[PDB]
Amino acid sequence: KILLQCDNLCKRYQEGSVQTDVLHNVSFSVGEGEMMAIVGSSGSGKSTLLHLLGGLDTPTSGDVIFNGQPMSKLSSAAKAELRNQKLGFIYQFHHLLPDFTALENVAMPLLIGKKKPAEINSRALEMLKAVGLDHRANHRPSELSGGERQRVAIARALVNNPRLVLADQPTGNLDARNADSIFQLLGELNRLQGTAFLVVTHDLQLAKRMSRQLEMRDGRLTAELS
Amino acid sequence: KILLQCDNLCKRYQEGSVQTDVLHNVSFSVGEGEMMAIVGSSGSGKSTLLHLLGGLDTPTSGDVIFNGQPMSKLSSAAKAELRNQKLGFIYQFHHLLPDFTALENVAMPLLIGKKKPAEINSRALEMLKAVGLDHRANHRPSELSGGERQRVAIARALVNNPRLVLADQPTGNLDARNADSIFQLLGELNRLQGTAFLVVTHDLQLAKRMSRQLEMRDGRLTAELS
Amino acid sequence: PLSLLIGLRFSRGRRRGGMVSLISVISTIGIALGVAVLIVGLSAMNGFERELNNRILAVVPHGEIEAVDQPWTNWQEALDHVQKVPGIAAAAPYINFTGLVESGANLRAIQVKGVNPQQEQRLSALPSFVQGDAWRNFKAGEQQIIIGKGVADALKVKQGDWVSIMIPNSNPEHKLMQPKRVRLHVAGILQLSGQLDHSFAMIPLADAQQYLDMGSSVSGIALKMTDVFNANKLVRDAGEVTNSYVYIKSWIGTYGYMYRDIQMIRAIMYLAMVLVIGVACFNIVSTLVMAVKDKSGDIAVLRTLGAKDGLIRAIFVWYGLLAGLFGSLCGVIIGVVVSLQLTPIIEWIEKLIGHQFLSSDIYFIDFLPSELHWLDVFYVLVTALLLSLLASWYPARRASNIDPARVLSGQ
Amino acid sequence: YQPVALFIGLRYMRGRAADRFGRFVSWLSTIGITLGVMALVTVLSVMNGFERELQNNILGLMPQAILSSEHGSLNPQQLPETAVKLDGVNRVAPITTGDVVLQSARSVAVGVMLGIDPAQKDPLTPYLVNVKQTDLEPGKYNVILGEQLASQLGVNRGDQIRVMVPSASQFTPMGRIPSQRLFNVIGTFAANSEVDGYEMLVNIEDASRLMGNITGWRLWLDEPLKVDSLSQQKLPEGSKWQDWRDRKGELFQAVRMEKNMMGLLLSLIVAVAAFNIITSLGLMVMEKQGEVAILQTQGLTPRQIMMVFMVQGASAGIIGAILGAALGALLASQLNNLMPIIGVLLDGAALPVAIEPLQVIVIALVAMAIALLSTLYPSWRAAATQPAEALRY
Ligand SMILES: Nc1ncnc2c1ncn2[C@@H]1O[C@H](COP(=O)(O)OP(=O)(O)OP(=O)(O)O)[C@@H](O)[C@H]1O
Ligand SMILES: Nc1ncnc2c1ncn2[C@@H]1O[C@H](COP(=O)(O)OP(=O)(O)OP(=O)(O)O)[C@@H](O)[C@H]1O
Ligand SMILES: [Mg+2]
Ligand SMILES: [Mg+2]
């Protein structure tokens, strides 16, 4: 079965008289519990595609179907719920709230989901230990390093046990060992919770661990090349 | 040879009467034209050390001497001159002025240096083309991508032909091809003008192209372990 | 220049911004509003201050010197002995008494003041431009004389009607006797106001000498000065040369309660003006502080590239001038228009609202008088420009003195 | 905790700070609200204090209003004391007023007659000195004068005063003799007011008038400045209705002008203060447009974002209003003892009341409502932008 489908997805940018288009009828489908890599060149259009599939932007030339529900014909009272439980998102620059601690940052989607308290701390600490951040659970994002500021976002995406995780470069600020550990964690999560992963990566080595690879040369999702 | 020398400097943090020590007696030295790599695990303290060497933070112990002049005891005008004419810096998160264009961002160090406007635009355009960003000179940082923003920061660092470049993960958000091209450009710059490149990198195979490969762990600069 | 370029880019920074950003328009209409309310308040204060001088101080005379109830003709040097103290604009000998006016069984008590033939209008502005009546042509003969319009309540008279006059003896002895009740011809009516022009009449000093018995002695003196609220000092000072008995009361002494009320009113108005100045200057400094606090990150980035503190100072004084000059100019443009030609009568009902806020409460007209000074406007512009420069300067240097790595990280 | 909106709103206040100046930028809105509220309450207190002080000290001795009846020496037989039905009436007592010329052994002056029953208590009673309001027998023609007047014309205890009534004059074809009487002063009287200059009192029953005298009716006013609305009244032929504005007319004009100017200055203060609250909170909402993008990414309903920003606005406004009310009350109560306005005018003082229930309460509530309403639109505008669009900056 399929989980997230997009077809004829075109996005163009126009602020002044100058036009700049980034996508050319991108069409692909992701099934449940599926590894996937969207490795590609810089400036190709990987991040904007991820924004479009997540419902955080308007494609204006197509539609994205999530679990049979198109994203355009969705009320704000329903988009929020989908975005809170069914889908998790990791930004490329790991946008964190710079007034909460790391523990509160990881536990924020659990608070938003109206979960009953006194185990929110347990799940947040479990995820912070899983990404390897037990000793930095009281530091604000301003007091965190760039490498471990990314792990907070990674844990925040995975703390709610979603169905599909859209990761935008979850590796670029990490070393090889931490990247390997986090990819093992993602594989373990797929094995147990069955969560599909759509990861945009620049590291070609760990991209081979992904079940499927795409290219996105110049805004078109080609099958495979280099 | 020598150009920059660290005299047993160490850094601690007081996060509200709580001590979290981050550095332990760093006493390494670098010559002129020596391309250096620092490698370490995430959260070890590479970026704090790089900030300390550039004069952007207080060492709270020891001192950093630039070819005979300590950075602790220096006039504000002299510090600004040093930072503008003979020291380039690449931030890990490429802080660029958001209201200016890419060309204006790259040309900004030349404008502060009081150069002739005829050559400023030519030099900025040449440096923008060097990182392969010719087709985005009119784009604001909000209209650029992660890789393009990183390349703009790299071009801004090298646009003034400094004697020493402090790079903090210059190829974090780049693919393999662009990272290889950037490192090649760094090599050509080192061979032509003789500028030392103190680069912090998370990539191991790309760090093998350096003269010395110091590994920094737990606030200490080990000779070589991994 | 580079600093002006950076300041203008900061002004138009938000997105494309069209012409200017949200921070720019919010920071430039606060200055305009402050300047407008400042000049409006100062114009209203000047308009009220003119009213007190015209309607209260000019109406009543200041100071006196009384006689020893004996024939005292040696007073011709008084007009030469009032210029010893500077500030005495004019002086005029005068006489006062009381009487009755009869016209159709409408007797009314009237105090009557005798004035100098030539100094009746230079001494004070009261009997000068009331109605342009048949004054300044009385002579010693032609005893027809002027009275206020408000005295003709039960009396129906005009410029030529005849009335009766009752006078007392006022002999120079220990006590008083029966009144003489010597009648006289009086004709002529003026109009000044409704408060003083109720039971007040006017007589010459020339015709007061005959049918009287003090031997052409002018008992009282009159004075006018500039320091009206300080006038107690100069009245005593000018009375150094006098007869054996001298009284040094003035408008302050005779009307102490009215003077106290006037001083209280002035103090309250000055307190309210100080409050307006304090409030209308806070929204200027506060809004410009937030802009620089927002731009602190770009200040750090500029300091990283090697920008000297002089460059940042120039950038932010240009930023303050751009946010201040346009705002102050718009402020004076709107304020001078709304103060010189105030919105006369369009105040009845405001725009339709879902819930009316405190309807049928106390409603007051804003201001009838307003004086254009064209000098306090310059002071308001100077203080607005100075405050705009000062507000966008201290946070600039405060952010410039921090290490770039700390502030750029978000600390 | 469970109310996530309240938690985020409380955490948005009490920011990172870590500096003396860092707290100032976060507390700018609270400081502005406090300044506006304090200025409003202290200026209202000063205004009300002046109005009350002038009202008491001037119109607590002179008749605020009186009717007229001169036909037949009218008694309440035509209409009892309950004849007046106008609003703002609190008490009515008999009175008799008119201009009278007083001749002494050495001087002649003028005054106004006051008719006060010995049994009836008048507002001028407590200021009597050395006398106990006695000797005002109907049979005796005893005269009460004023201290200022008595010093002015030189009359003390044990003297005689000739009384002439110009209004009550019998016109005949011999002379022009008005009503003439001889009164004896058998007491010392005083009052600390302007009215002491010409106050003088007698019994109502006297033959001072032609006919055996006119009988007015003193009418106390709950609002002595309401007199502009004295149009609704009834009176018989040959008489009229009178107000306190017949005397001190320039005082009434000055009071009206001062009230108008104070109202204008109040409007200016409100206009400046309301603008500062509206813009500062809107800019605080607009500045954190990236935070709401992250919250919407995590799954926050726009209603929840509106609640977050409304909670922050309320938390700022309540503290600002309370601090402003406290500071304004303290400044009003200490405008003279502390002497903050050192450059005080000569013989000039400011009198406050700082009345609580109707002045310092509604202002704070209006300020809090303005703080609430200023936040709603910017939060709605920020919640409409796409999360990936706002986060690009
Ligand atoms: N106020 C603070 N400023 C900076 N680092 C702090 C502070 N308080 C605690 N720390 C911790 O000190 C360490 C310093 O690490 P640093 O910021 O230099 O990054 P790093 O080791 O180069 O990491 P990476 O390259 O993976 O981002 C981190 O673990 C950080 O969480
Ligand atoms: N608002 C915009 N106006 C114009 N061009 C834009 C706009 N937003 C994005 N672009 C361009 O469209 C392309 C899409 O960039 P995108 O962020 O998808 O790249 P990327 O592959 O993720 O980058 P990186 O390698 O830096 O991570 C880029 O070339 C970018 O410059
Ligand atoms: Mg991207
Ligand atoms: Mg780092």
Numbering used by the authors:
A (entry chain D), B (entry chain F): 3 to 228
C (entry chain E): 4 to 414
D (entry chain C): 2 to 212, 217 to 398
From the manuscript:
Lipoproteins, anchored in the OM via their N-terminally linked fatty acyl chains, are key OM components that play essential roles in OM biogenesis and maintenance of its integrity. Depending on their roles, mature lipoproteins are either retained in the periplasmic leaflet of the IM or transported to the OM by the localization of lipoprotein (Lol) pathway, which consists of five proteins LolA-E25. LolCDE forms an ATP-binding cassette (ABC) transporter in the IM, which sorts and transports lipoproteins destined for the OM by consuming energy from ATP hydrolysis. In this study, we determined the cryogenic electron microscopic (cryo-EM) structures of endogenously captured lipoprotein- or ATP-bound LolCDE reconstituted in nanodiscs.
To investigate the molecular basis of ATP-bound LolCDE, we determined the structure of the mutant complex LolCDE171QE. The structure of E. coli LolCDE171QE reconstituted in nanodiscs was determined to 3.2 Å using cryo-EM. Despite the absence of added nucleotides, additional cryo-EM densities were observed in the catalytic pockets of LolD, which were identified as ATP molecules and magnesium ions. The nucleotide-binding domains (NBDs) of LolCDE171QE adopt a closed conformation, tightly sandwiching the endogenously captured ATP molecules between the RecA-like subdomain and the α-helical subdomain of opposing LolD subunits. In the ATP-bound LolCDE171QE structure, a pair of polar residues, Q301 and T302, from the coupling helix of LolC interact with R85 on the side helix (S78-Q87) and Y93 on the Q-loop (I92-A104) of one LolD subunit, while R306 and T307 from the coupling helix of LolE interact with S78 on the side helix and Y93 on the Q-loop of the other LolD, respectively. In the ATP-bound structure, TM1 and TM2 of both LolC and LolE are more parallel, creating a closed interface as opposed to the V-shaped cavity observed in the lipoprotein-bound structure. This closed interface between LolE and LolC is incompatible with lipoprotein binding, as the TM2 helix of LolE in the ATP-bound LolCDE171QE structure would clash with the triacyl chains present in the lipoprotein-bound structure. In this structure, TM2 of LolE undergoes an inward and upward movement, resulting in an approximately 90-degree bend at the periplasmic neck, transitioning from a relatively straight conformation in the lipoprotein-bound structure to a bent conformation in the ATP-bound state. In the ATP-bound structure, the hook of LolC lifts and shifts towards the interface between the PDs, positioning itself to be accessible by both LolA and the bound lipoprotein.
